Design a protein around this ligand. Sequence first.
Ligand code: CJL
Length: 154
Amino acid sequence: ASRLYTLVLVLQPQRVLLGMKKRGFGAGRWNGFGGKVQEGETIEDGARRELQEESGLTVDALHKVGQIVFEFVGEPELMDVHVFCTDSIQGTPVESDEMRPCWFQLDQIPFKDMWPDDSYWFPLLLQKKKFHGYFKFQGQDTILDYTLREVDTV
Ligand SMILES: Nc1nc(NC2CC2)cc(N2CCN(C3COC3)CC2)n1
């Protein structure tokens, strides 16, 4: 049994949009935009909703680029994160109560202040390769095990 989450990366030729999480789970780390998928909405509906809630942005089309399953020691529910990419967005990103957005050059991605797993799978994101990932965490900082592979269908 697993819970559905979304993660949206606005990735452009020279820059990627990241948000500084201001509260809740993962506060103090840069990440893409997303959250829990609700009842009554598709996964992509949920990605669009969290994107707009956290940045004010809307998008024409979201592309599926990955899936990452996380296990936390002692926690019965697996986290099933569906990762999406878009290039062109509608609007200018602005700060919300949950996220402070900034553009990062692709050689200045702040991996030190991101979830540790990002260092493993962001390269595949940057190569526009579709991937499946699995990470086993002890707490929030320690990766105990992981698998990562390119796939044909996300
Ligand atoms: N880049 C990245 N890494 C993660 N690592 C696992 C935690 C160890 C999780 C993650 N997402 C799952 C959580 N979700 C939170 C913001 O509200 C829920 C954002 C996207 N995104």
